[PDB]
């Protein structure tokens, strides 16, 4: 309404980057039609992830950089977003760093 860094990527773009690993029960051919938008949240290290899967708006949720670091420290390779999307923790950290923390 008033007249602001973000990331807007399809699942297919995130696959190509190695950030997305799989989406359970979704054929690869549909990855172009899954869209992620990531913006900085309302706390340090917090990012708000919005998504639209095949035209359907998903419930916003919150990624915390410190949680990703804890996964990485624990040797966990992947984290699940929206129940069925698996993302590579190392490459998500790298994308968040490159696009936001720099």
Swiss-Prot record:
Protein name (Swiss-Prot/TrEMBL): Ras GTPase-activating-like protein IQGAP3
Organism: Homo sapiens
